[PDB]
Amino acid sequence: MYDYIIVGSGLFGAVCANELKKLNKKVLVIEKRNHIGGNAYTEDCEGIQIHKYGAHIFHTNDKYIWDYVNDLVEFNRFTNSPLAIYKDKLFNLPFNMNTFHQMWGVKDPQEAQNIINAQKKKYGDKVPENLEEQAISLVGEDLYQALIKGYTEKQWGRSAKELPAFIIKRIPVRFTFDNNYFSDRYQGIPVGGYTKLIEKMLEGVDVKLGIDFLKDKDSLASKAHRIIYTGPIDQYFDYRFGALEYRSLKFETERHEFPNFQGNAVINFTDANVPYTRIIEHKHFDYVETKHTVVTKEYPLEWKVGDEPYYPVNDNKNMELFKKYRELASREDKVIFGGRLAEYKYYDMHQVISAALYQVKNIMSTD
Amino acid sequence: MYDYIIVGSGLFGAVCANELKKLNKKVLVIEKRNHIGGNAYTEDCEGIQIHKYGAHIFHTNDKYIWDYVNDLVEFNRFTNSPLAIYKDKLFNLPFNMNTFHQMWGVKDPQEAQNIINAQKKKYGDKVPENLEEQAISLVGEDLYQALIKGYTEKQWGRSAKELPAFIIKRIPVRFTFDNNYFSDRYQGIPVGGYTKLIEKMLEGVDVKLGIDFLKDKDSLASKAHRIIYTGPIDQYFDYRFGALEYRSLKFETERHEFPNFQGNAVINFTDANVPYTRIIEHKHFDYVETKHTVVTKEYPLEWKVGDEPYYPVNDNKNMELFKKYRELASREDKVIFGGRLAEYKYYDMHQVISAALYQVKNIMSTD
Ligand SMILES: Cc1cc2nc3c(=O)[nH]c(=O)nc-3n(C[C@H](O)[C@H](O)[C@H](O)COP(=O)(O)OP(=O)(O)OC[C@H]3O[C@@H](n4cnc5c(N)ncnc54)[C@H](O)[C@@H]3O)c2cc1C
Ligand SMILES: Cc1cc2nc3c(=O)[nH]c(=O)nc-3n(C[C@H](O)[C@H](O)[C@H](O)COP(=O)(O)OP(=O)(O)OC[C@H]3O[C@@H](n4cnc5c(N)ncnc54)[C@H](O)[C@@H]3O)c2cc1C
């Protein structure tokens, strides 16, 4: 008889297991996939650790959380500086002086700011109610047209004027020459990959692979006093009210017999006419010398049952749907719903780790 | 009676004092300036910590050394990404794909490499007779003409074709888009400045300011069993064999009543026709909100024995001179010679800290 059965071996579940195992609680982890780690899972290809479900860069301002993962696996000092390719132009992301210099030839910070502020003139100053308006209010017309619109429209397969103002976490807009994608004090990649990190978390824990909890809900749930569920919340209740909308992704990977394909870990293609949204060259995440390189093309698509859910469409319709499942969940006796899927929300890794730690503390305050 | 009298309160001296005070040794620090910290000294101007004697960025691959300084003062995650302005063109340093893209429009790593490999061979395998040929064989003429020539000529006193190839033994080149000047695993600036850090190292130690050890050598020497000397080695022996040659710098600093002057901590001017070699905007080393900004222009300065020693020439002539003083120093006992000035060498901060830690361990294991 287990104290806890944890559904899903992603960061949320792996962290709960790592903490509960130290509190002397008997734990079982059930994962439907043939590998652990969830969306952060990495796989080695002759020395190159491959980010299987999208580029994953760790970043936080919380020193306790940075030390928590670093105490398990050492992280390098990788800094995420994505590139943006639009037609025949290459630009540096996030929005900084390098970007403005490339776009207009400007070198002076004040000058660059006047320009951006002047493109927002045609549009006026109403409160932004959609992504296109929110994007233009921050970077102006030229930057939006070249670097945001086509990209956003491909990833959400919807028009920008139709998406919510905050459907995407905003990236930096600064007036210094700095291609650092994140403003955090700590940032890096685990040397050896994330799979290794999650392995440390699950060390000394019973873990069963290839098992879908929802295919044997009642039976499996009777084997433990408490259940920690990190799968899709709507699927947990048989899509009873309809399915929550997401955007999925498809990754086309290929090995090449030369050492450097594009010279950067991440490159986005912001032209609506190029099918894929990104190309990821995995070796650049962590210095290695191999004669080959593995490159991944990322293509977005509308999520259907059977696909992996990646980007939740956080608009009013879906948020009302989520509230209905939340009511059902609020009634579920022995189940704790946590993680990106169970909460219908996009979580960065540090946020999810932080959510899991609070939840295990909250469980121990009083069982 | 002190066990140790440390001459100079720069990093080398401050580290020896920090370690010796930990071993219950009575220590006295003597500094000729009115402030501590040596060449790394920082001064606050209404919230902006000013790097008084040149931009100083900390970096190391030694985790022990990084934790050593961090346990005293916390460091931020500043990344040195110097820029260069040549005429009306702006380039990213160090030499990387961003640079090459700016120079030739190239985006492919292999393509950039072909361009450079070819240009390196302008004069075939011919062995470089001078500095200009040396540089051209390392990176080609386009990069050399635009980013090295004028800069190098200003910092030395004239023509590249009239200078020794030895001056530039290597010019780092990478084929990834990465403006990070240092490849080290650790890099940052101390929050609050370097003076604060050194004050922590000297905490609880007797320090005397404004005293030039050499104007009262005997009296000051009798106050301890051992002397650790970090001043000029040649000056210590009265320039007995002549003075060691150094290159010097002069700084002109201005306060401006606006928050952002150039949007970057360091910008080099590689045009021989612009007097200064660099402009430093101190606040960008460590994030702060001030309505003003302090900017410093750096100019190569002709050096005479008496001017501030910044960079040692280190040519055969001077190394020879150094060996002679080194022989004398080897006859001087109870006196330890250490630091950039005492050893006639250019040291990075982590190297000098490392040298002081081992020097003390050597001092302990031998007595
Ligand atoms: C494309 C992409 C890129 C990202 N990049 C970054 C980044 O750069 N930096 C960052 O900090 N964060 C990034 N993130 C966010 C990161 O992936 C999430 O924070 C993390 O996955 C959250 O952990 P989780 O356990 O909640 O969910 P998940 O990792 O998704 O894991 C849930 C696990 O539950 C399993 N499971 C589900 N249902 C069942 C069931 N019925 N039975 C058994 N097992 C089940 C799944 O197979 C899976 O392994 C990215 C996310 C995406 C989609
Ligand atoms: C322009 C410049 C930029 C630099 N930038 C970087 C950088 O970005 N990153 C990095 O890692 N390193 C950098 N360095 C290197 C750094 O400055 C040195 O590593 C550091 O100064 C070495 O410490 P030190 O104690 O050996 O010498 P110093 O700091 O020079 O200190 C010696 C001290 O002894 C005092 N003194 C000398 N003679 C006497 C005497 N007779 N009596 C009493 N007191 C005396 C001096 O006044 C001084 O305070 C830079 C150096 C220069 C010159």
PDB file of C-alpha atoms in Angstrom, chain B residues 58-222:
ATOM      1  CA  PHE B  58      35.842  38.768 -13.213  1.00  0.00           C
ATOM      2  CA  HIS B  59      36.084  35.361 -14.806  1.00  0.00           C
ATOM      3  CA  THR B  60      37.358  31.900 -13.984  1.00  0.00           C
ATOM      4  CA  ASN B  61      36.925  28.153 -14.577  1.00  0.00           C
ATOM      5  CA  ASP B  62      37.916  27.387 -10.997  1.00  0.00           C
ATOM      6  CA  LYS B  63      34.742  26.821  -8.984  1.00  0.00           C
ATOM      7  CA  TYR B  64      36.662  27.091  -5.714  1.00  0.00           C
ATOM      8  CA  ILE B  65      37.933  30.511  -6.708  1.00  0.00           C
ATOM      9  CA  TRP B  66      34.484  31.630  -7.884  1.00  0.00           C
ATOM     10  CA  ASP B  67      32.879  30.512  -4.587  1.00  0.00           C
ATOM     11  CA  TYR B  68      35.709  32.169  -2.653  1.00  0.00           C
ATOM     12  CA  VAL B  69      34.846  35.667  -3.916  1.00  0.00           C
ATOM     13  CA  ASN B  70      31.140  34.963  -3.947  1.00  0.00           C
ATOM     14  CA  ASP B  71      31.021  34.022  -0.246  1.00  0.00           C
ATOM     15  CA  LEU B  72      32.352  37.532   0.424  1.00  0.00           C
ATOM     16  CA  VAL B  73      30.283  39.591  -2.029  1.00  0.00           C
ATOM     17  CA  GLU B  74      27.661  38.391  -4.475  1.00  0.00           C
ATOM     18  CA  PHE B  75      28.384  38.701  -8.190  1.00  0.00           C
ATOM     19  CA  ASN B  76      25.839  39.389 -10.905  1.00  0.00           C
ATOM     20  CA  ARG B  77      25.797  37.529 -14.271  1.00  0.00           C
ATOM     21  CA  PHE B  78      27.268  40.363 -16.400  1.00  0.00           C
ATOM     22  CA  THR B  79      28.725  39.123 -19.681  1.00  0.00           C
ATOM     23  CA  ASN B  80      31.429  41.189 -21.298  1.00  0.00           C
ATOM     24  CA  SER B  81      30.309  41.702 -24.928  1.00  0.00           C
ATOM     25  CA  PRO B  82      32.558  44.550 -26.191  1.00  0.00           C
ATOM     26  CA  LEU B  83      31.653  46.504 -29.301  1.00  0.00           C
ATOM     27  CA  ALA B  84      33.891  48.215 -31.835  1.00  0.00           C
ATOM     28  CA  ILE B  85      33.127  51.313 -33.866  1.00  0.00           C
ATOM     29  CA  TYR B  86      35.182  51.774 -37.012  1.00  0.00           C
ATOM     30  CA  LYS B  87      34.103  54.948 -38.804  1.00  0.00           C
ATOM     31  CA  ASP B  88      30.364  54.807 -39.293  1.00  0.00           C
ATOM     32  CA  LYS B  89      30.270  50.988 -38.826  1.00  0.00           C
ATOM     33  CA  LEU B  90      29.553  49.151 -35.600  1.00  0.00           C
ATOM     34  CA  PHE B  91      30.765  45.597 -34.970  1.00  0.00           C
ATOM     35  CA  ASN B  92      30.364  42.986 -32.231  1.00  0.00           C
ATOM     36  CA  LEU B  93      33.528  41.668 -30.563  1.00  0.00           C
ATOM     37  CA  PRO B  94      35.110  39.127 -30.049  1.00  0.00           C
ATOM     38  CA  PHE B  95      35.403  37.754 -33.552  1.00  0.00           C
ATOM     39  CA  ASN B  96      32.324  35.555 -33.993  1.00  0.00           C
ATOM     40  CA  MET B  97      29.478  34.883 -36.488  1.00  0.00           C
ATOM     41  CA  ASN B  98      27.791  38.200 -35.556  1.00  0.00           C
ATOM     42  CA  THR B  99      31.008  39.999 -36.573  1.00  0.00           C
ATOM     43  CA  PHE B 100      31.341  38.083 -39.845  1.00  0.00           C
ATOM     44  CA  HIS B 101      27.637  38.612 -40.644  1.00  0.00           C
ATOM     45  CA  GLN B 102      28.163  42.328 -40.134  1.00  0.00           C
ATOM     46  CA  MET B 103      31.311  42.327 -42.216  1.00  0.00           C
ATOM     47  CA  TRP B 104      30.237  40.145 -45.162  1.00  0.00           C
ATOM     48  CA  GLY B 105      26.537  39.334 -44.782  1.00  0.00           C
ATOM     49  CA  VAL B 106      27.409  35.676 -44.262  1.00  0.00           C
ATOM     50  CA  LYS B 107      25.151  33.533 -42.012  1.00  0.00           C
ATOM     51  CA  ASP B 108      26.611  30.079 -42.638  1.00  0.00           C
ATOM     52  CA  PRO B 109      29.516  28.937 -40.395  1.00  0.00           C
ATOM     53  CA  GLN B 110      31.342  27.025 -43.154  1.00  0.00           C
ATOM     54  CA  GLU B 111      30.978  29.987 -45.501  1.00  0.00           C
ATOM     55  CA  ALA B 112      32.462  32.399 -42.915  1.00  0.00           C
ATOM     56  CA  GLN B 113      35.371  30.054 -42.391  1.00  0.00           C
ATOM     57  CA  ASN B 114      36.108  29.842 -46.150  1.00  0.00           C
ATOM     58  CA  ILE B 115      36.279  33.625 -46.393  1.00  0.00           C
ATOM     59  CA  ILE B 116      38.748  33.900 -43.505  1.00  0.00           C
ATOM     60  CA  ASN B 117      40.949  30.904 -44.448  1.00  0.00           C
ATOM     61  CA  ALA B 118      41.326  32.375 -47.919  1.00  0.00           C
ATOM     62  CA  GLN B 119      42.139  35.894 -46.694  1.00  0.00           C
ATOM     63  CA  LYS B 120      44.692  34.501 -44.207  1.00  0.00           C
ATOM     64  CA  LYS B 121      46.626  33.417 -47.319  1.00  0.00           C
ATOM     65  CA  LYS B 122      46.866  36.802 -49.056  1.00  0.00           C
ATOM     66  CA  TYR B 123      50.670  36.409 -48.958  1.00  0.00           C
ATOM     67  CA  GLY B 124      50.806  32.624 -48.944  1.00  0.00           C
ATOM     68  CA  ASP B 125      52.708  30.719 -46.271  1.00  0.00           C
ATOM     69  CA  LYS B 126      55.207  33.567 -46.013  1.00  0.00           C
ATOM     70  CA  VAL B 127      56.437  33.916 -42.399  1.00  0.00           C
ATOM     71  CA  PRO B 128      55.236  37.272 -40.969  1.00  0.00           C
ATOM     72  CA  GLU B 129      58.027  39.852 -41.001  1.00  0.00           C
ATOM     73  CA  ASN B 130      56.002  42.370 -38.974  1.00  0.00           C
ATOM     74  CA  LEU B 131      52.835  42.869 -36.891  1.00  0.00           C
ATOM     75  CA  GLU B 132      50.651  43.652 -39.889  1.00  0.00           C
ATOM     76  CA  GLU B 133      51.568  40.403 -41.626  1.00  0.00           C
ATOM     77  CA  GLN B 134      51.156  38.531 -38.365  1.00  0.00           C
ATOM     78  CA  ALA B 135      47.623  39.806 -37.887  1.00  0.00           C
ATOM     79  CA  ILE B 136      46.656  39.283 -41.548  1.00  0.00           C
ATOM     80  CA  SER B 137      47.766  35.659 -41.351  1.00  0.00           C
ATOM     81  CA  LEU B 138      45.579  35.166 -38.274  1.00  0.00           C
ATOM     82  CA  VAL B 139      42.305  36.670 -39.489  1.00  0.00           C
ATOM     83  CA  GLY B 140      42.740  38.172 -42.944  1.00  0.00           C
ATOM     84  CA  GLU B 141      42.833  41.763 -44.083  1.00  0.00           C
ATOM     85  CA  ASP B 142      39.209  42.822 -43.867  1.00  0.00           C
ATOM     86  CA  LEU B 143      38.946  42.026 -40.119  1.00  0.00           C
ATOM     87  CA  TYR B 144      42.476  43.267 -39.512  1.00  0.00           C
ATOM     88  CA  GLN B 145      42.041  46.572 -41.360  1.00  0.00           C
ATOM     89  CA  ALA B 146      38.721  47.360 -39.747  1.00  0.00           C
ATOM     90  CA  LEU B 147      39.158  45.972 -36.237  1.00  0.00           C
ATOM     91  CA  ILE B 148      42.815  45.475 -35.330  1.00  0.00           C
ATOM     92  CA  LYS B 149      45.219  47.809 -37.150  1.00  0.00           C
ATOM     93  CA  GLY B 150      44.242  51.288 -35.958  1.00  0.00           C
ATOM     94  CA  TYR B 151      43.505  50.018 -32.451  1.00  0.00           C
ATOM     95  CA  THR B 152      46.846  48.279 -32.049  1.00  0.00           C
ATOM     96  CA  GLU B 153      48.703  51.191 -33.580  1.00  0.00           C
ATOM     97  CA  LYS B 154      47.210  53.635 -31.138  1.00  0.00           C
ATOM     98  CA  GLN B 155      47.950  51.504 -28.087  1.00  0.00           C
ATOM     99  CA  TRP B 156      51.654  51.043 -29.105  1.00  0.00           C
ATOM    100  CA  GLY B 157      52.849  54.234 -30.741  1.00  0.00           C
ATOM    101  CA  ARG B 158      52.558  53.726 -34.500  1.00  0.00           C
ATOM    102  CA  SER B 159      52.809  51.523 -37.579  1.00  0.00           C
ATOM    103  CA  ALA B 160      51.857  47.895 -37.520  1.00  0.00           C
ATOM    104  CA  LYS B 161      54.381  47.214 -40.296  1.00  0.00           C
ATOM    105  CA  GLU B 162      56.938  48.829 -37.963  1.00  0.00           C
ATOM    106  CA  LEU B 163      56.043  46.599 -35.011  1.00  0.00           C
ATOM    107  CA  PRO B 164      57.212  43.096 -33.928  1.00  0.00           C
ATOM    108  CA  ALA B 165      54.966  40.143 -34.878  1.00  0.00           C
ATOM    109  CA  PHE B 166      55.349  38.918 -31.262  1.00  0.00           C
ATOM    110  CA  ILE B 167      52.895  41.534 -29.948  1.00  0.00           C
ATOM    111  CA  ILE B 168      49.938  39.526 -31.258  1.00  0.00           C
ATOM    112  CA  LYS B 169      50.449  35.777 -30.963  1.00  0.00           C
ATOM    113  CA  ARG B 170      46.818  34.865 -31.434  1.00  0.00           C
ATOM    114  CA  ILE B 171      43.396  36.333 -32.235  1.00  0.00           C
ATOM    115  CA  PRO B 172      40.456  34.126 -31.033  1.00  0.00           C
ATOM    116  CA  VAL B 173      37.931  33.258 -33.769  1.00  0.00           C
ATOM    117  CA  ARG B 174      34.712  31.287 -33.311  1.00  0.00           C
ATOM    118  CA  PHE B 175      32.100  30.211 -35.805  1.00  0.00           C
ATOM    119  CA  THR B 176      29.019  30.438 -33.602  1.00  0.00           C
ATOM    120  CA  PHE B 177      26.889  33.524 -32.946  1.00  0.00           C
ATOM    121  CA  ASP B 178      28.243  34.378 -29.522  1.00  0.00           C
ATOM    122  CA  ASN B 179      29.358  37.793 -28.316  1.00  0.00           C
ATOM    123  CA  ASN B 180      30.703  36.456 -24.990  1.00  0.00           C
ATOM    124  CA  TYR B 181      34.257  37.737 -24.576  1.00  0.00           C
ATOM    125  CA  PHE B 182      35.273  35.024 -22.089  1.00  0.00           C
ATOM    126  CA  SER B 183      34.859  31.284 -22.544  1.00  0.00           C
ATOM    127  CA  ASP B 184      35.039  30.714 -18.754  1.00  0.00           C
ATOM    128  CA  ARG B 185      32.388  28.747 -16.887  1.00  0.00           C
ATOM    129  CA  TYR B 186      32.037  31.671 -14.437  1.00  0.00           C
ATOM    130  CA  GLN B 187      31.809  35.394 -15.168  1.00  0.00           C
ATOM    131  CA  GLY B 188      30.373  38.443 -13.401  1.00  0.00           C
ATOM    132  CA  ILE B 189      30.871  41.701 -11.508  1.00  0.00           C
ATOM    133  CA  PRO B 190      30.689  42.088  -7.736  1.00  0.00           C
ATOM    134  CA  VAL B 191      27.409  43.778  -6.764  1.00  0.00           C
ATOM    135  CA  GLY B 192      28.556  46.855  -4.851  1.00  0.00           C
ATOM    136  CA  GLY B 193      32.014  46.919  -6.461  1.00  0.00           C
ATOM    137  CA  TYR B 194      35.518  45.504  -6.047  1.00  0.00           C
ATOM    138  CA  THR B 195      36.483  47.858  -3.196  1.00  0.00           C
ATOM    139  CA  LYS B 196      33.713  46.287  -1.094  1.00  0.00           C
ATOM    140  CA  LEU B 197      35.094  42.815  -1.853  1.00  0.00           C
ATOM    141  CA  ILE B 198      38.641  43.741  -0.877  1.00  0.00           C
ATOM    142  CA  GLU B 199      37.408  45.479   2.277  1.00  0.00           C
ATOM    143  CA  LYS B 200      35.859  42.122   3.243  1.00  0.00           C
ATOM    144  CA  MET B 201      39.179  40.362   2.709  1.00  0.00           C
ATOM    145  CA  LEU B 202      40.956  42.963   4.901  1.00  0.00           C
ATOM    146  CA  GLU B 203      38.300  42.895   7.575  1.00  0.00           C
ATOM    147  CA  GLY B 204      39.887  42.672  11.054  1.00  0.00           C
ATOM    148  CA  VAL B 205      43.346  43.427   9.689  1.00  0.00           C
ATOM    149  CA  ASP B 206      45.646  46.313  10.527  1.00  0.00           C
ATOM    150  CA  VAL B 207      45.934  48.516   7.449  1.00  0.00           C
ATOM    151  CA  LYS B 208      48.010  51.670   7.107  1.00  0.00           C
ATOM    152  CA  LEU B 209      47.304  54.009   4.189  1.00  0.00           C
ATOM    153  CA  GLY B 210      49.446  56.594   2.428  1.00  0.00           C
ATOM    154  CA  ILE B 211      52.754  54.881   3.208  1.00  0.00           C
ATOM    155  CA  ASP B 212      55.324  53.952   0.605  1.00  0.00           C
ATOM    156  CA  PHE B 213      57.150  51.010   2.214  1.00  0.00           C
ATOM    157  CA  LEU B 214      60.322  51.841   0.308  1.00  0.00           C
ATOM    158  CA  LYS B 215      60.768  55.296   1.941  1.00  0.00           C
ATOM    159  CA  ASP B 216      61.152  53.624   5.359  1.00  0.00           C
ATOM    160  CA  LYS B 217      62.240  50.101   4.452  1.00  0.00           C
ATOM    161  CA  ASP B 218      64.342  49.169   7.525  1.00  0.00           C
ATOM    162  CA  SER B 219      62.058  50.492  10.187  1.00  0.00           C
ATOM    163  CA  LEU B 220      59.023  48.921   8.541  1.00  0.00           C
ATOM    164  CA  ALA B 221      60.900  45.681   7.877  1.00  0.00           C
ATOM    165  CA  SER B 222      61.876  45.210  11.536  1.00  0.00           C
TER     166      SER B 222
END
